[PDB]
Design a protein around this ligand. Structure first.
Ligand SMILES: O=c1ccn([C@@H]2O[C@H](COP(=O)(O)OP(=O)(O)C[C@H]3O[C@H](CO)[C@H](O)[C@H](O)[C@H]3O)[C@@H](O)[C@H]2O)c(=O)[nH]1
Ligand SMILES: O=c1ccn([C@@H]2O[C@H](COP(=O)(O)OP(=O)(O)C[C@H]3O[C@H](CO)[C@H](O)[C@H](O)[C@H]3O)[C@@H](O)[C@H]2O)c(=O)[nH]1
Ligand SMILES: [Mn+2]
Ligand SMILES: [Mn+2]
Lengths: 282, 282
């Protein structure tokens, strides 16, 4: 049950004035594509606070990638879901190397030890699904699953939340589908033919409700096991499987490349009003 | 659980090319605004057929308005949810005046007798909520609630379906909120101040999931009873209450005026590529 919004004073949306004319803001299956200027964060914050929303954020920091945690977490504190309940889940082979980061109120962090192992990146799907299944369902409403070699520079908030989302890979958002680096070998479960595909989604930022994320990660894990049994490894590993899944199960929101950007590689194009979550040199 | 979509060949959506540049296609709370060119109906038909979706359509035909049923139903057969399961619920004081309309496969019609009574238009909220509650929950997935003094001229399909939707009133989609005919007396439960409001929604086309429609109709009925006890009748009756509800509970899709148009009164502006559901002279 959703209680009523309070009275709010804000600018009237005008039907005969687009928010953005330079970009696609809705997919052909009627999922919003999230860009700056498409949302009123005050309305969305109200909606999600009235539900006492809890967001889980998963991040893997295995072997040398523990070095990225301090900046990742410190900047998440500045920019990720501020004002909402947040539970970080840090998966690592080195629990003692997790930095002691000071958290705002209503935010918590759990360190989950895993075994260290391409395979590091792939096995995230298993670890997220099997068997963090039970824990996530009890503790959070949404899960957000990201790469650690990153920093938050600007707002990443409840505008992303939805049953299932993917994020446009910053190298391919202007590309034709034939150019997307989908798995192209028919022998792989991740196979997508040259005439199929909506977008190329980045493996380092996806999420949704706990139920939908567990479905996605279970399916991707199962598909990766089939490939392993058949002696084939998808070209971009878990990302190839994520792309196959999101082709056949359309996301209910798509995040623009504001949400996953590499300024060193790609600069700061006019079409990006904000750079929210960005690559750190590795 | 949602099964996988099959392989489909269709045009690639391009992020740097809007579908429509002349109109707002997403609200500030990230609800799609449904216009021609924003959706691929083949994708949406697949999604909804894979769930074996059943859509209920409620329509009231009381006193002289039984004359509108033949054209309403015959044109609904041509244009409303074709290919999907449909259950019409015709509420009337004259069961014998309901015309015998030939239905396509997977479609059915029930005649529900009510007592005849502004008040005719208002009491729809009670009749929809109390006590068709039980029946609708067992029989359909979505409910669509419309005026009868209308005809379908073009496609109205699963692109509208969502947990809760309203439709832009064709007289006000280009208007400033101060001009909207909201109830303006603070003594009414439907009261909206001059500095509040997103859109003016038409009382003759709303819908959603059964649960969300029962919430809306229950709330509007309760609010109308409070007004009656306080000796006040909202300026546009049930529509005034619908507008209050949708201000405080944002719809998850908004239908463009393609979905509720009056050509005699308003012509055929360039911004309307299709006239889908239109007023009949009364
Ligand atoms: O030793 C490890 C190795 C990985 N990891 C974990 O796995 C995540 C993904 O790996 P990485 O970021 O290197 O891939 P990326 O290189 O960012 C993967 C991305 O960039 C590619 C170019 O290198 C392509 O653009 C591809 O499309 C894109 O997904 C990393 O952020 C860590 O959370 C870890 O903890 N320890
Ligand atoms: O004797 C009756 C009376 C009503 N009804 C039922 O109630 C529905 C609404 O009434 P109506 O269409 O006259 O209102 P509209 O006039 O279309 C109401 C609409 O137009 C108004 C102008 O007349 C304003 O524009 C208003 O904003 C808008 O809602 C009608 O379609 C029938 O299903 C019935 O069965 N028998
Ligand atoms: Mn990375
Ligand atoms: Mn009418």
């Amino acid at each position: 049950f959703m209680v009523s919004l309070p009275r709010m004073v804000y600018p009237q949306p005008k039907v005969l004035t687009p928010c953005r004319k330079d970009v696609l803001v809705v997919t052909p299956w009627l999922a919003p594509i999230v860009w700056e200027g498409t949302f009123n964060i005050d309305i969305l914050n109200e909606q999600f606070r009235l539900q006492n929303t809890t967001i889980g954020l998963t991040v893997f920091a295995i072997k040398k990638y523990v070095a990225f945690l301090k900046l990742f977490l410190e900047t998440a504190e500045k920019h990720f879901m501020v004002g909402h309940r947040v539970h970080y889940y840090v998966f690592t082979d080195q629990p003692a190397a997790v930095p002691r980061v000071t958290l705002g109120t209503g935010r918590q962090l759990s360190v989950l030890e895993v075994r260290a192992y391409q395979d590091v990146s792939m096995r995230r799907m298993e670890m997220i699904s099997d068997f963090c299944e039970r824990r996530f369902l009890s503790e959070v409403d949404y899960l957000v699953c990201v790469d650690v070699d990153m920093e938050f520079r600007d707002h990443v908030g409840v505008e992303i939340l939805t049953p299932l989302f993917g994020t446009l890979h910053p190298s391919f958002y202007g590309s034709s589908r034939e150019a997307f680096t989908y798995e192209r070998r028919p022998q792989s479960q991740a196979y997508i033919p040259k005439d199929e595909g909506d977008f190329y989604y980045m493996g380092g930022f996806f999420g949704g409700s706990v139920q939908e994320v567990q479905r996605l990660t279970r399916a991707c894990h199962q598909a990766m096991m089939v490939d392993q049994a058949n002696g084939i490894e998808a070209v971009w590993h878990d990302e190839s499987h994520l792309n196959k899944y999101l082709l056949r199960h359309k996301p209910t929101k798509v995040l623009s490349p504001e949400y996953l950007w590499d300024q060193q590689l790609l600069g700061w194009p006019a079409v990006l009003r904000k750079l929210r979550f960005t690559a750190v040199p590795k």
